[PDB]
Short mmCIF file of all heavy atoms in Angstrom, two decimals:
data_model
loop_
_atom_site.label_atom_id
_atom_site.label_comp_id
_atom_site.label_asym_id
_atom_site.label_seq_id
_atom_site.Cartn_x
_atom_site.Cartn_y
_atom_site.Cartn_z
N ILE A 471 -2.12 6.38 -4.91
CA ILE A 471 -1.41 5.34 -4.15
C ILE A 471 -0.37 5.95 -3.20
O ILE A 471 -0.07 5.39 -2.15
CB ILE A 471 -0.75 4.28 -5.10
CG1 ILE A 471 -0.18 3.10 -4.31
CG2 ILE A 471 0.29 4.91 -6.04
CD1 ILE A 471 -1.22 2.12 -3.84
N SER A 472 0.14 7.12 -3.58
CA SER A 472 1.06 7.89 -2.74
C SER A 472 0.40 8.39 -1.45
O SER A 472 1.06 8.51 -0.42
CB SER A 472 1.65 9.06 -3.53
OG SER A 472 0.78 9.49 -4.57
N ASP A 473 -0.91 8.66 -1.51
CA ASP A 473 -1.69 9.08 -0.34
C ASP A 473 -1.89 7.95 0.67
O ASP A 473 -1.96 8.19 1.88
CB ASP A 473 -3.05 9.62 -0.77
CG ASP A 473 -2.99 11.04 -1.29
OD1 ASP A 473 -2.41 11.90 -0.60
OD2 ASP A 473 -3.53 11.28 -2.38
N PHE A 474 -1.99 6.73 0.16
CA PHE A 474 -2.14 5.54 0.98
C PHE A 474 -0.88 5.29 1.81
O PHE A 474 -0.92 5.38 3.04
CB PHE A 474 -2.43 4.31 0.10
CG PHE A 474 -3.88 4.17 -0.29
CD1 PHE A 474 -4.64 5.27 -0.68
CD2 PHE A 474 -4.48 2.91 -0.31
CE1 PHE A 474 -5.98 5.12 -1.06
CE2 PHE A 474 -5.81 2.76 -0.69
CZ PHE A 474 -6.56 3.86 -1.06
N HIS A 475 0.23 5.02 1.14
CA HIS A 475 1.45 4.57 1.82
C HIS A 475 2.28 5.67 2.49
O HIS A 475 3.40 5.43 2.92
CB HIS A 475 2.32 3.70 0.88
CG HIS A 475 3.02 4.47 -0.20
ND1 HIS A 475 2.55 4.51 -1.50
CD2 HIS A 475 4.15 5.21 -0.18
CE1 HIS A 475 3.37 5.25 -2.23
NE2 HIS A 475 4.34 5.69 -1.46
N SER A 476 1.72 6.88 2.57
CA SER A 476 2.34 7.96 3.34
C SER A 476 1.62 8.19 4.67
O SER A 476 2.10 8.92 5.53
CB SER A 476 2.41 9.26 2.52
OG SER A 476 1.15 9.61 1.99
N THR A 477 0.47 7.54 4.82
CA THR A 477 -0.31 7.59 6.05
C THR A 477 0.27 6.57 7.03
O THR A 477 0.47 5.41 6.67
CB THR A 477 -1.78 7.24 5.79
OG1 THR A 477 -2.27 7.99 4.67
CG2 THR A 477 -2.64 7.54 7.02
N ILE A 478 0.55 7.02 8.26
CA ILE A 478 1.07 6.14 9.31
C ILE A 478 0.02 5.10 9.70
O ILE A 478 -1.15 5.44 9.86
CB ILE A 478 1.56 6.95 10.54
CG1 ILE A 478 2.76 7.82 10.15
CG2 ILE A 478 1.94 6.02 11.69
CD1 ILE A 478 3.24 8.77 11.25
N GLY A 479 0.44 3.85 9.83
CA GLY A 479 -0.48 2.75 10.09
C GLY A 479 -1.03 2.68 11.50
O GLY A 479 -0.54 3.34 12.42
N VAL A 480 -2.08 1.86 11.67
CA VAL A 480 -2.69 1.58 12.97
C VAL A 480 -2.43 0.11 13.29
O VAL A 480 -3.03 -0.78 12.69
CB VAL A 480 -4.22 1.85 12.96
CG1 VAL A 480 -4.78 1.73 14.36
CG2 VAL A 480 -4.53 3.21 12.37
N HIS A 481 -1.55 -0.13 14.26
CA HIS A 481 -1.03 -1.47 14.54
C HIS A 481 -1.57 -2.05 15.85
O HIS A 481 -1.56 -1.36 16.88
CB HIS A 481 0.50 -1.41 14.56
CG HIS A 481 1.17 -2.75 14.62
ND1 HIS A 481 1.78 -3.23 15.77
CD2 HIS A 481 1.34 -3.70 13.68
CE1 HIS A 481 2.29 -4.42 15.52
NE2 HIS A 481 2.04 -4.73 14.26
N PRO A 482 -2.03 -3.32 15.84
CA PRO A 482 -2.15 -4.22 14.70
C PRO A 482 -3.58 -4.33 14.13
O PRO A 482 -4.51 -4.66 14.86
CB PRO A 482 -1.75 -5.56 15.30
CG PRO A 482 -2.15 -5.45 16.76
CD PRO A 482 -2.42 -4.00 17.08
N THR A 483 -3.72 -4.07 12.83
CA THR A 483 -5.00 -4.27 12.14
C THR A 483 -4.76 -4.94 10.79
O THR A 483 -3.63 -5.02 10.31
CB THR A 483 -5.76 -2.94 11.90
OG1 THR A 483 -4.99 -2.06 11.07
CG2 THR A 483 -6.09 -2.24 13.22
N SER A 484 -5.84 -5.42 10.18
CA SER A 484 -5.79 -5.89 8.81
C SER A 484 -5.71 -4.68 7.87
O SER A 484 -5.10 -4.75 6.80
CB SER A 484 -7.00 -6.76 8.48
OG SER A 484 -7.00 -7.93 9.26
N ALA A 485 -6.33 -3.58 8.28
CA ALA A 485 -6.43 -2.38 7.45
C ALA A 485 -5.10 -1.64 7.27
O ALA A 485 -4.89 -1.02 6.23
CB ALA A 485 -7.49 -1.44 8.01
N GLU A 486 -4.22 -1.72 8.26
CA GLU A 486 -2.91 -1.05 8.21
C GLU A 486 -2.07 -1.47 7.01
O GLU A 486 -1.13 -0.77 6.62
CB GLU A 486 -2.11 -1.31 9.50
CG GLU A 486 -1.48 -2.69 9.57
CD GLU A 486 -0.63 -2.91 10.81
OE1 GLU A 486 0.27 -2.09 11.08
OE2 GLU A 486 -0.87 -3.93 11.50
N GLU A 487 -2.42 -2.61 6.43
CA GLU A 487 -1.68 -3.17 5.31
C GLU A 487 -1.93 -2.42 4.00
O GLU A 487 -1.15 -2.55 3.06
CB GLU A 487 -1.97 -4.68 5.17
CG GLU A 487 -1.05 -5.44 4.20
CD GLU A 487 0.44 -5.31 4.52
OE1 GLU A 487 0.79 -5.14 5.71
OE2 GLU A 487 1.25 -5.40 3.58
N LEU A 488 -3.00 -1.62 3.96
CA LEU A 488 -3.28 -0.72 2.83
C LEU A 488 -2.17 0.32 2.63
O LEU A 488 -1.96 0.81 1.52
CB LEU A 488 -4.62 -0.01 3.02
CG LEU A 488 -5.90 -0.69 2.54
CD1 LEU A 488 -7.09 -0.24 3.38
CD2 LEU A 488 -6.17 -0.42 1.07
N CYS A 489 -1.47 0.65 3.71
CA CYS A 489 -0.44 1.68 3.69
C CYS A 489 0.98 1.12 3.58
O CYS A 489 1.95 1.86 3.69
CB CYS A 489 -0.57 2.56 4.93
SG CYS A 489 -2.23 3.20 5.19
N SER A 490 1.09 -0.19 3.36
CA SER A 490 2.40 -0.84 3.23
C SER A 490 2.71 -1.30 1.80
O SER A 490 3.84 -1.66 1.50
CB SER A 490 2.54 -2.00 4.22
OG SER A 490 2.93 -1.52 5.49
N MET A 491 1.70 -1.28 0.94
CA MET A 491 1.89 -1.64 -0.46
C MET A 491 2.57 -0.51 -1.24
O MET A 491 1.94 0.48 -1.61
CB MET A 491 0.56 -2.05 -1.10
CG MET A 491 0.18 -3.50 -0.84
SD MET A 491 -1.55 -3.87 -1.15
CE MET A 491 -2.28 -3.22 0.35
N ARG A 492 3.88 -0.69 -1.48
CA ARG A 492 4.71 0.31 -2.16
C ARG A 492 5.01 -0.05 -3.61
O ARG A 492 4.83 0.76 -4.51
CB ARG A 492 6.02 0.52 -1.40
CG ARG A 492 5.95 1.53 -0.27
CD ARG A 492 7.35 1.88 0.20
NE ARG A 492 7.42 3.25 0.71
CZ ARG A 492 7.74 4.32 -0.02
NH1 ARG A 492 8.03 4.19 -1.32
NH2 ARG A 492 7.78 5.52 0.54
N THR A 493 5.48 -1.28 -3.82
CA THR A 493 5.93 -1.74 -5.13
C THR A 493 4.86 -2.58 -5.80
O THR A 493 4.39 -3.55 -5.21
CB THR A 493 7.21 -2.59 -5.01
OG1 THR A 493 7.77 -2.45 -3.70
CG2 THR A 493 8.22 -2.18 -6.05
N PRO A 494 4.47 -2.22 -7.04
CA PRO A 494 3.48 -2.98 -7.81
C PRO A 494 3.94 -4.42 -8.06
O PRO A 494 5.10 -4.64 -8.39
CB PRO A 494 3.41 -2.23 -9.14
CG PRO A 494 3.88 -0.86 -8.84
CD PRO A 494 4.93 -1.04 -7.79
N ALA A 495 3.02 -5.37 -7.91
CA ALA A 495 3.31 -6.77 -8.21
C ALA A 495 3.56 -6.98 -9.71
O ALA A 495 4.36 -7.83 -10.09
CB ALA A 495 2.19 -7.66 -7.71
N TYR A 496 2.87 -6.20 -10.54
CA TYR A 496 3.07 -6.17 -11.99
C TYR A 496 2.25 -5.05 -12.64
O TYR A 496 1.70 -4.21 -11.94
CB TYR A 496 2.76 -7.53 -12.63
CG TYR A 496 1.39 -8.06 -12.33
CD1 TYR A 496 0.32 -7.82 -13.20
CD2 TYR A 496 1.15 -8.80 -11.17
CE1 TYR A 496 -0.95 -8.32 -12.92
CE2 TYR A 496 -0.11 -9.30 -10.88
CZ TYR A 496 -1.16 -9.05 -11.76
OH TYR A 496 -2.41 -9.54 -11.47
N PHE A 497 2.19 -5.05 -13.98
CA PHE A 497 1.59 -3.95 -14.74
C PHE A 497 0.69 -4.42 -15.89
O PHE A 497 0.71 -5.59 -16.27
CB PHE A 497 2.69 -3.06 -15.33
CG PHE A 497 3.59 -2.43 -14.31
CD1 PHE A 497 4.75 -3.07 -13.89
CD2 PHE A 497 3.30 -1.17 -13.80
CE1 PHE A 497 5.59 -2.48 -12.95
CE2 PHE A 497 4.15 -0.57 -12.86
CZ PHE A 497 5.29 -1.23 -12.44
N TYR A 498 -0.09 -3.48 -16.43
CA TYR A 498 -0.74 -3.64 -17.73
C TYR A 498 -0.38 -2.45 -18.61
O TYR A 498 -0.64 -1.30 -18.26
CB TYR A 498 -2.27 -3.73 -17.59
CG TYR A 498 -2.78 -5.05 -17.08
CD1 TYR A 498 -2.79 -5.34 -15.72
CD2 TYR A 498 -3.27 -6.01 -17.96
CE1 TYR A 498 -3.28 -6.56 -15.24
CE2 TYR A 498 -3.76 -7.23 -17.50
CZ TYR A 498 -3.76 -7.50 -16.14
OH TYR A 498 -4.23 -8.70 -15.67
N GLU A 499 0.24 -2.74 -19.76
CA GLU A 499 0.64 -1.71 -20.72
C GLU A 499 -0.26 -1.78 -21.95
O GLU A 499 -0.04 -2.58 -22.86
CB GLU A 499 2.12 -1.88 -21.10
CG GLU A 499 2.91 -0.57 -21.19
CD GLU A 499 4.42 -0.76 -21.05
OE1 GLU A 499 4.87 -1.72 -20.38
OE2 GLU A 499 5.17 0.08 -21.60
#
């Protein structure tokens, strides 16, 4: 996931949003 959000985005696309997800919405333990 670190590889995703360290890549600079391509604006404007739907795909650029893959690199903006930083914080998990929730977890499974």
Side-chain angles (χ1 to χ4, degrees):
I471 188 77
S472 28
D473 281 309
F474 278 42
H475 73 259
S476 52
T477 312
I478 295 174
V480 188
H481 189 254
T483 62
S484 296
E486 77 177 307
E487 191 57 29
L488 274 152
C489 308
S490 277
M491 277 163 281
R492 274 193 150 268
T493 346
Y496 55 94
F497 300 90
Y498 284 82
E499 222 158 332

